[PDB]
């Protein structure tokens, strides 16, 4: 498994930012706001403790302009042909990938506008292709993604 790239289509400081990814990522720069918003975007995608609070008014590009937030992550689901990690990596989800020879897995985030009821309504969808993404099935409060990724956040 290997992270490939992340696309933040809208956030509180990002407009059309596309970042390539890998394992063991190191992010630096002068803009501390951009780094902490990148980490908050990662937490919003992969942690339920921040997902359960929803989006506010201040977490947009402008506070009323372009109320449409998408955060997409690529996964590189396939492995080597001599390694049997491919089926064990695939077998967490069943109906998301139509083809057994699919290569790249997508995990996406969707946001609703903030004029009515003042709330964000975080929606998560995954799939092996950009179009016709399916919703992540959650039977209770815990969805299917939280059984896969356990996020540990360290900050002294």
């Amino acid at each position: 498994m290997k992270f490939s790239n992340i696309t933040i289509k809208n956030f509180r400081n990002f407009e059309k930012v596309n970042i390539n990814l890998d394992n063991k990522n190191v992010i630096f720069g002068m803009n501390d706001i951009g780094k902490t918003n990148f980490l908050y975007a990662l937490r919003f995608l992969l942690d339920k403790e921040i997902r359960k609070f929803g989006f506010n008014k201040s977490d947009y590009h402008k506070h009323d302009t372009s109320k449409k937030i998408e955060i997409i992550l690529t996964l590189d689901l396939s492995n080597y042909e001599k390694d049997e990690d491919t089926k064990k990596l695939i077998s967490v989800v069943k109906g998301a990938r139509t083809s057994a020879n699919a290569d790249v897995f997508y995990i996406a985030l969707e946001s609703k506008y903030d004029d009515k009821e003042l709330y964000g309504n975080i929606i998560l969808k995954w799939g092996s292709e950009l179009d016709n993404l399916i919703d992540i099935p959650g039977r209770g409060n815990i969805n299917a993604l939280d059984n896969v990724f356990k996020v540990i956040y360290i900050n002294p």
Binding site: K112, Y113, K116, E117, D131, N132
Partner: protein
């Protein structure tokens, strides 16, 4: 203010059933959006609305103009309305507990011709089918029977939905007219109805134009309205657009000065004056959409090659063989958009198959058009079209159309280019400018029409295709002697602006 303004103001503050007899397209959905925006803002209760269109693409266009809401509005096709509000929640109540609640509804395989045999498809093999006849609807009649039988379906559809907004009622069979009249008779739900009576009905085979036209002759509980859609913005162009020769001249009222019509040219220096309204008078805006309508397509290239030397980089789009009026023009144009754009999404073409609500059957038609990806001009074009034709019915609407369909992709490129992207500086001839409206226009008075002094439709589309501004320029003597006749007989001398 004549037929444009009073039709809008009498349709916003109304509160009863509405039957609008709109024109032949060109913005009937503007008033559908503007009424919904007025109705949703006026009503402050928990009741929501429902907007019904035929194609799924027009449902996204209505949703795009509206925005988004959390009121529980239903925007979509009529097939999605019946399958999700009446059948799927209430199938297990009205027709027995043993009937299943989840199913896939394919309209590509089943061709049964019995109602009682129809329930055997749903009960046994979990498939919701369709009738044999085009003049039938198994889905809409099942929604009528469930609503008539069970009680809690009736407790739903009155208490959530305020008014159902209906569009293209003219090509509607008997079954959908029975359900939509049932919601008005007993359950007391208001309706909004738009469409054009008769005048070459197409779409959703099985039409029955006594459902719509019979609701204008003898019906009484319907506020009937005339041609109401405002194709042209403002008033000053409309007075020019209502001239022709006579008849509508009594509907024209004129003022002391004009605003949107400028006539300054005599010796046409095309590059010089057309620059001068941009900077020296601030009339023309380059960033806005500039459309220029001329005839004789070789002369448009001569204009194009002149401005390519200057730098305007003008674009011409010609008359395709498919631009002739045919019932299959809407989806045949979209098919070549799938293959010639080389990246175009299949679900945009999937958003045009009449009633839509197609899941997993898009991949069946994806493989058929993927066989058309090979060039293979001679002998693959006939069969793979007929294979694509036979899947979605509407069969033998061909011969003349398929010969023109071979002509547009003859040698794979009839002129290499097609309307696949978005660009400005477009030229349209009269053969292919019908239907879509234009923001800016510099057509310089639409010459070469004094020879006939007849054929009033030809200068009608030259005048009415603009939105708010339009430029008429004194160029020709015979045009001037023709328009000097229209000075005196209009009873008002003002056509020109001067201090």
């Amino acid at each position: 203010m004549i037929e444009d303004e009073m039709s809008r103001e009498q349709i916003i503050k109304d509160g009863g059933n509405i039957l609008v007899t709109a024109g032949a397209g060109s913005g009937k959905t503007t008033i559908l959006v503007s009424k919904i925006e007025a109705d949703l803002k006026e009503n402050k209760t928990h009741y929501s609305i429902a907007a019904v269109t035929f194609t799924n693409k027009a449902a996204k266009e209505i949703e795009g103009r509206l925005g988004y809401s959390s009121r529980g509005n239903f925007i979509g096709t009529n097939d999605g309305f019946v399958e999700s509000e009446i059948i799927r929640p209430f199938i297990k109540d009205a027709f027995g507990n043993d009937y299943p609640d989840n199913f896939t509804a394919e309209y590509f395989d089943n061709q049964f011709a019995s109602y009682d045999k129809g329930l055997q498809v749903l009960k046994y093999q979990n498939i919701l089918g369709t009738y044999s006849n085009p003049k039938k609807n198994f889905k809409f009649q099942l929604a009528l029977d469930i609503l008539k039988k069970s009680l809690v379906a009736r407790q739903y559809i009155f208490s959530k939905y305020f008014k159902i907004f209906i569009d293209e009622y003219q090509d509607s069979d008997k079954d959908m007219h029975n359900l939509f009249m049932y919601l008005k008779d007993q359950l007391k739900i208001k309706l909004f109805i738009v469409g054009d009576p008769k005048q070459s009905i197409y779409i959703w085979r099985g039409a029955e134009p006594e459902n719509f036209n019979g609701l204008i002759e003898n019906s009484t509980d319907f506020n009937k309205y005339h041609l109401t859609s405002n194709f042209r913005c403002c008033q000053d162009i409309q007075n020019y657009s209502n001239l022709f020769n006579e008849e509508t001249r009594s509907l024209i009222k004129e003022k002391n000065e004009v605003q949107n019509v400028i006539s300054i040219a005599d010796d046409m220096p095309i590059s010089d004056i057309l620059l001068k309204l941009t900077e020296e008078k601030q009339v023309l805006n380059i960033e806005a959409e500039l459309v220029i309508l001329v005839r004789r397509r070789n002369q448009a290239i001569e204009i194009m090659k002149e401005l390519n030397e200057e730098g305007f980089n003008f674009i011409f789009i010609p008359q395709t063989p498919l631009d002739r009026a045919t019932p299959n023009a809407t989806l045949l144009k979209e098919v070549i958009k799938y293959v010639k754009n080389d990246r175009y999404s299949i679900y945009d073409l999937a958003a045009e198959i009449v009633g839509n609500l197609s899941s997993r059957e898009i991949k069946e038609i994806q493989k058929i058009i993927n066989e058309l990806l090979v060039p293979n001009i001679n002998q693959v074009l006939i069969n793979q079209v007929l294979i694509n034709l036979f899947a979605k019915l509407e069969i033998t609407l061909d011969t003349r159309e398929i010969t023109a369909f071979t002509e547009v992709m003859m040698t794979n490129e009839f002129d290499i280019a097609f309307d696949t992207n978005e660009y400005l500086h477009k030229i349209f001839t009269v053969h292919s400018a019908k239907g879509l409206e234009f923001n800016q226009v510099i057509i310089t008075a639409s010459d070469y029409n004094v020879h006939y002094n007849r054929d009033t439709n030809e200068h009608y589309v030259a005048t009415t295709r603009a939105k708010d501004k339009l430029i008429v320029i004194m160029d020709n003597k015979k045009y001037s002697d023709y328009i000097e006749t229209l000075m005196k007989e209009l009873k008002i001398k003002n056509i020109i602006k001067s201090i």
